[PDB]
Ligand SMILES: CC(C)(COP(=O)(O)OP(=O)(O)OC[C@H]1O[C@@H](n2cnc3c(N)ncnc32)[C@H](O)[C@@H]1OP(=O)(O)O)[C@@H](O)C(=O)NCCC(=O)NCCSO
Ligand SMILES: [Cl-]
């Protein structure tokens with residue numbers, strides 16, 4: 001009915017600072033679609049094992065394990081850059097951020113050392129972070145040390161996106177809604193395919209188009225063909 | 235023929251100033267597709283009535299009314315921030331800008347108080363703004379006071395886009411070309427769907443992903459299910 | 469399993485500088501899908517004439533010639549602006565850059581004077597630039613004078629992208645992976661269509677949405693209907 | 703107690719949803735015998751939903767000093783032709799208007815009924831002008 005001016009205060013002040021700092025990063029965008037038909041089936045077969053263990057298993061633990069496997073081949077995506085992009089710190093831990101918005105705005109807790117965790121341990125840790133997130137009881141150690149982020153915008157809606165990189169990280173992916181679409185198979189028959197879009201932003205001062213693209217193709221081959229993941233897990 | 239250097243002058247200076255000011259806004263992109271099969275059919279039913287009343291009825295009056303209804307639920311999308319983004323002004327009037335290009339460049343008049351205007355009054359005012367716009371006759375009061383912008387790039391071409399936010403607004407949507415695509419219905423049969431893409435940009439210092447995504451899903455439910463709009467209009 | 473700090477040095481310094489200068493450009497993005505079914509067929513028929521002449525003929529020569537044709541109608545897209553964007557230099561030569569990542573190296577050699585070259589001459593020069601490109605032997609003259617850029621990300625992967633404009637240029641296009649998708653023909657029958665995505669970025673200080681979109685529609689008509697190119701070539 | 707005719711105030715500035723809200727409120731009070739004076743007075747036009755129980759057509763009695771009343775019959779599925787000429791399931795409802803013919807002529811009641819019916823047969827017609 002009438003205009004109203006309000007302070008930006010509290011835990012809101014941090015998104016202002018974080019996003020302002022991201023203006024120093026020249027964002028390159030690269031996007032793709034990934035055929036999740038096989039993963040959808042896989043997850044349905046694994047759901048009762050996870051539920052029998054008291055864990056909810058979404059698609060995120062798969063996306064995270066695949067990003068970790070890709071980041072081992074393209075370690076420059078799990079790196080940080082200094083004040084005027086003069087030196088690159090290759091970071092060994094894959095502490096991968098889960099962007100969540102609470103009844104308080106943006107919170108980005110991370111799963112620590114994804115590289116040494118099984119898909120099941122990741123699911124476990126995701127459930128612990130969601131439980132604390134929704135309670136507003138995430139601790140400092142859950143929030144610091146992030147090295148890469150994924151934003152599952154599709155748990156709510158969307159296709160493509162242009163996510164903003166979280167300084168001092170150099171990359172972020174946004175995942176869209178998994179949707180059944182008509183797609184051709186090998187024999188050229190119109191089939192039901194479970195398609196998801198992915199939108200990557202990368203700091204183009206240090207990350208070139210080919211690196212993000214090859215990383216993305218690798219992440220994508222692991223999800224399209226989850227058996228590729230098996231080959232090198234211990 | 236040979237290189238020719240040339241002053242940017244007169245009205246062309248304003249887009250330079252406007253777009254350069256937009257560099258201060260950390261843009262977040264969120265996109266989606268909307269199924270407009272039912273709206274396309276509905277617009278065909280209404281076309282003859284609007285025509286009898288001397289109005290061209292396009293899709294815009296629908297997009298605008300659905301945007302207004304969505305903004306009632308997500309009022310922070312119809313708001314401004316100050317230089318530092320220290321304070322937010324929630325703006326009560328939905329003065330929704332219509333980006334148009336003329337030979338002197340970018341011109342964004344707005345429809346005042348969309349929230350108390352019907353789809354037919356919105357179409358009338360759009361028609362008035364287009365005529366004036368093309369004749370170079372927009373008033374100062376047609377141009378000032380905008381609180382939110384839509385850009386129908388799809389009147390010319392395109393699917394997705396990354397629109398630039400117009401300070402001091404915090405969000406803008408770009409609408410792509412409505413195109414027929416093969417999509418599944420609930421029976422799981424390949425049907426002819428009229429699909430349109432939407433691309434929202436939002437000032438990420440104060441707007442998080444969930445807000446823009448929930449707003450978008452609401453706008454989109456009103457357009458996919460126009461019955462939804464009827465429930466709360468008077 | 470330890471972090472490692474490493475200087476950015478050598479030809480890695482140049483991408484930092486270029487991409488940081490690009491932060492001063494307010495990027496507008498505009499995207500589309502192009503139906504390349506006829507072109508895929510056309511290239512297949514020319515491929516054997518190309519081989520006989522000792523030339524590999526990809527899609528890029530077609531993309532390059534159609535861009536040069538559109539740039540003739542929309543010369544503002546082949547222009548540069550100054551520091552504070554007070555003067556436009558319309559550049560006569562179409563020196564179209566081909567963004568390449570080597571092992572080096574974001575490197576962007578260009579095809580000089582595309583406006584006076586046949587598709588086969590463009591393919592010849594592309595082959596030369598690819599040969600020297602992969603040997604790290606591209607010369608200074610191959611690298612300078614660029615006026616517009618295309619980035620074939622789809623040689624590796626992708627659908628849409630957000631490419632970064634290369635100062636002092638005002639536009640860049642990124643081309644996604646050509647992929648067969650079910651699409652309707654005029655009869656409303658589900659056909660196999662070779663679809664490619666294009667993502668344009670343009671300096672919205674001097675380039676409006678209508679210009680990039682009409683240019684894109686023109687480029688796209690030339691590729692969807694390659695007969696249109698025949699009419700006006702000499 | 704027999705006949706009770708509360709009314710919804712100023713329908714012209716109310717949404718379908720606010721009208722539903724007021725109907726529920728009036729139904730609830732009506733059935734507790736708790737309708738207020740204000741609920742009961744000021745009526746300008748009346749509808750009687752006979753079809754909540756049964757019926758097709760009816761002859762409703764106008765309520766002085768109003769000039770018109772409509773009675774709504776039971777909605778039911780009847781075989782009807784589409785525009786192709788195929789036999790379709792159609793949900794058919796009858797409406798019966800009574801109007802004071804000293805001042806309301808037949809063209810007025812018919813034209814009003816045709817407009818009322820257009821809005822219900824084609825609901826998007828309501829979308830056009832609601833705010
Ligand atoms: C915290 C979290 C990432 C966790 O996501 P998650 O691990 O998928 O868990 P969830 O939300 O409980 O998922 C529940 C259901 O949604 C489904 N789902 C999740 N992501 C999906 C996607 N991209 N597409 C389709 N379905 C999805 C899951 O399959 C699950 O389905 P069932 O209940 O049928 O098994 C998510 O809830 C969230 O907050 N994401 C929002 C991202 C965001 O807000 N980013 C904005 C950008 S800037 O502020
Ligand atoms: Cl940028």
Ligand SMILES: [Cl-]
Nearest residue numbers: 022023260261
């Ligand atoms: Cl940004």
Ligand SMILES: [Cl-]
Nearest residue numbers: 256257494495
């Ligand atoms: Cl910008």
Ligand SMILES: [Cl-]
Nearest residue numbers: 181415416649
């Ligand atoms: Cl598609």
